[PDB]
Amino acid sequence: ILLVNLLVAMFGYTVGIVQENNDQVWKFQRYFLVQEYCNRLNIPFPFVVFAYFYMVVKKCFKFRNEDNETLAWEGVMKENYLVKINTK
Amino acid sequence: SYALYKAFSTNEQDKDNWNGQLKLLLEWNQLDLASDEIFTNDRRWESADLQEVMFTALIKDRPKFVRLFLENGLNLQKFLTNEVLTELFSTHFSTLVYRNLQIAKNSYNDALLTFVWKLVANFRRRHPLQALFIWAILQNKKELSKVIWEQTKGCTLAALGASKLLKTLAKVKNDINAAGESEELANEYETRAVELFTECYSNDEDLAEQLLVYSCEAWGGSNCLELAVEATDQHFIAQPGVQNFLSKQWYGEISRDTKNWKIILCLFIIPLVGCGLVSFRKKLLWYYVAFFTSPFVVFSWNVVFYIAFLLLFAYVLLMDFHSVPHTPELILYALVFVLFCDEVRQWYMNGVNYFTDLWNVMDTLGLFYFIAGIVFRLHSSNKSSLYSGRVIFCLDYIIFTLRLIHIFTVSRNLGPKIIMLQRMLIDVFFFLFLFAVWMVAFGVARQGILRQNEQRWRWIFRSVIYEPYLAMFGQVPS
Amino acid sequence: VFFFLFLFAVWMVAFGVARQGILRQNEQRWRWIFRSVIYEPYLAMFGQVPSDVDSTTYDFSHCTFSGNESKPLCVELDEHNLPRFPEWITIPLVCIYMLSTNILLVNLLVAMFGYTVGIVQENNDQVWKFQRYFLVQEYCNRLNIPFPFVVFA
Amino acid sequence: IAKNSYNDALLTFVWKLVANFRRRHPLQALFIWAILQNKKELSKVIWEQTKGCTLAALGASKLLKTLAKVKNDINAA
Amino acid sequence: NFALKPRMRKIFSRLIYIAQSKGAWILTGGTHYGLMKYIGEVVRDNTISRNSEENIVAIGIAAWGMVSNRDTLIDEGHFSAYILDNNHTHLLLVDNGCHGHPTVEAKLRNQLEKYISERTSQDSNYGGKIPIVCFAQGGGRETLKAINTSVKSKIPCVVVEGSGQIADVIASLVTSSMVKEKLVRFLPRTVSRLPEEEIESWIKWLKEILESSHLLTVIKMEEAGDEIVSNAI
């Protein structure tokens, strides 16, 4: 009775605390599954072993200007952001 | 200072000495005076002789003066010669800061701190503003950092790298004052990175998602999104711009404003890819491949495969398990080999950090127990080995089945609760600690009062541990 | 409720298949597969504790030896006509399953109910008095007499 | 996209009237024009000139809550 | 050398924002030095921010007697390190004789001003006629001669600030003695190289300026909120 009903109360307190952080932690974890399913040029899982043999095929034989342009884009909203802060 | 300047200026010989007036107004904090009657006539600005006064404004913490010097014209990357950086890190670099850097490299080592340890090892014996920014950011200078940060190209990358460095140095236990300063400055730069990127995103989506993926020709050798991951900067990834980016990469070619039942219904009826029930915004074989490439459906196919694997496992183990493997065990070993190939693929493409995750550890461990059950299984005409093979497969089935909880963390509804589930461990362990103490005390007292000199160990532990354990589900010892 | 039933079904399937595999050998009857794999681990949620794990409280008068009558199969025997299963592998298995479902998973459901009751309460009175519109519009629309007599109207 | 994926009675009505004028309560149509464009200050000036003011505010609130569900262009949402 | 305080930085950011809004040409010197540097900077920034909707037009008008590296072609050139600016989308260079000739382009420039000031384009709100505003923020002989050539012409619409050098001496007093009093107090170190035979000429220049005070307006220091450039123009 006492020790089980104390566990209920401590669970209730922890659920109450972690909930506003919980959605953030879930969508932070979302990055890793997107990076494990968007990285590999990936076919069906059962068939994947056949595509693994394509990698065997590999071992059967084996400053940029738009970058500076998008950094120059970033600088303008930086200036507008600084204007907003100094306006506050 | 104003009295000294009135004396120095009215000697009618050093009226022409703008350098001596400037150095006098620099050694004091007379900013308004140096603004109003040195840089105002527009009569003599050479813009190259400002180097000694720049070095002095750096090493004596005059950030408003370096702001005025940049505003009137001085290029940092012209100025910041490697001799300047070796003078800053060799002579003007503090010795308590370097000891905290040693302690943080020995006790809390990291990828970015390995990188900054190597560059601070370089200059005590090419992206210059980032090195000056690291110098100012480590010293906890907090206002020279802002002045140099406003002059950078990769501004969001700079803010995220600085936030990671300062969060690592805020863990060093000696000198908790310096830990408190570095924690506050870390929070200030991570707030700055978030608020700048949300303005970049709220003006424009395509160019902000252009920003997110670049590596700045080895900043720390990494990426803006990677640096937010490494610092566990989960307020930068929880924001709606990065979440929009991620969900657009998760649905792939399918437009996100379609309902989900249409997607899975088109998944089960395979040649229904060629019809107007799924919108493919973000000739007919392109609709085919645009469906079957997306992350959503290769994931959903993979979980259907895995459930069919668990049903075949269960059928084999419970209803069809003989002295020689019949055909469903051979199909089962083929499917387990497929899972083995996926795990060795993931290990070959991660390296060492693959063994950091606990799921991959128990994953490899389950494959080990499966092949051990095979080598116990093939010794036919021996009943003990064949029974032992089946027992090994049953415990391995427990592991394979409980992996399904980890699979369903991607869901929009179940997912956050499964993530919440691991925050309960300290409550469970406090419960089990108190319960084990009570259980041992009551069990030893009851076994001592009732009986006399039990010699059998199994009947010691059935009475002392097992029956007081069963009292937790309401059994009441007999 | 659905998060609870998801976790409980995963634990129930894992424990039930492992226990039926360790104890018995090649059951062919589907009803006795599902009474053992699904139904008895389900009854452990109300505090039942599965009976056939001890081997000191196991009698052979509730078996069949071949599925011929109603009863379950016997546990698979030895050449000495003794049960093969290790008590040191099945007693802690039932203990871990019983801890995990009867205590941890039910008391987590209590905590999540408590959190949801705490959130929805200040919205709840609004939702009730928003729902009130529909019953007023279904009882104020029709020129309505007594329900039994309504068929006459 | 909002008519194809989140269709409604009022959005069917405004789809039909915007289909009319791209080929009698005039202030309500001008109010819909300004209210869809997210104009946000011409809307108030026309709203202060209307007869059915509460009906106007409720119809506009329903239209904008439907268009705030369209997933592309989350800024406009 | 140019004094770039953040207020004038804000003002000319706002100015090139207005010129992007209305679709205006901006005429200026077009060298790399001083204010024209910053104007080319903000032209490049508002170009690189939106990359569409009526890319603005900046004409720099240079003298060709002050351009250092001069290449004759028909065949693009490559101007590299008076120096021209990198960001002016059009450059016009007047032709004269020798190198020692500043202030040559003023005649062609002011004639182009007068011609657009009389040129009629009825798709406007000004009664046609294409409105023209002159800004003076700095100082020198060029500024005073430009303001008087404007105000002697029709449609000058000259605007000045409340900070600068000659913007201060026209901004403050809005005869000979008061011109002298303001000119010696707002230019303490440039009167020292001046014969009075052209100081009296400057007094005549300013008396010709203040003849038409309705064709002149000013920006003040209390008027320092947002959209004060729009309010002035």
Ligand SMILES: O=C1NC(c2cccc([N+](=O)[O-])c2)=CCN1c1ccccc1O
């Ligand atoms: O790729 C996978 N490998 C294994 C796996 C492979 C071998 C051994 C074990 N194991 O013992 O838990 C697990 C777990 C399930 N799995 C998977 C299936 C569908 C969707 C997502 C997934 O991660």
Ligand SMILES: [Ca+2]
């Ligand atoms: Ca894995």
